[model samples]
Target: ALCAFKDPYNGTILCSKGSTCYGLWNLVKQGCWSHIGDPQECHYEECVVTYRFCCCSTDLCNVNFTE
Candidate 1:
């Protein structure tokens, strides 16, 4: 599906995939915790929740989120 977001601030034409725009976050768990001493923003659970789920087998879930 084609997705787009309105950049109100026009901030470098990139969105925060998890917490950073550099694609450093883990796609599986969706978090940034490479360093032990660094302050980690626990957004793994939140990231997964934000994703839209769809099932083709079910007719009730055929609506598009972008539209």
Candidate 2:
């Protein structure tokens, strides 16, 4: 499956890997923290007043939250 990618800045595409896609958000940063799964999470589980990261195993599913 195609995952989300934002590391390069533009990040409006899903060319990371056949792995799971993720959407990461915080008070200062927000983007796709993808490539999770066999390649990835614990801190992601920690609760924060300004942190939001949701993982999903669907094709092109991360673009929906990057905004």
Q: List, residue by residue over 1-67, the lDDT tens digit for candidate 1.
A: 1112222231122223322211111121111222223334222222222233211111111222221
RMSD of each: 13.5, 6.8
Among all candidates shown, the one with the greatest TM-score: 2
> TM-scores of the models, in the given order?
0.15, 0.43
Which tens-of-lDDT digit does each residue in 1-67 have in candidate 2?
A: 4545555245444445444555656323333344544523312322222256555555556544532
The lDDT values for all models are: 0.22, 0.45
Over 4 Å off in model 2, which ranges? 8-18, 26-50
Q: Tell me how far the alpha carbon of residue 20 in candidate 1 is from the true structure, in angstroms, after superposition.
A: 13
How far out, in Å, is residue 25 in model 1?
A: 10
Tell me how many clashing residue pairs each candidate has: 0, 0
| TM-score of decoy 2 | 0.43
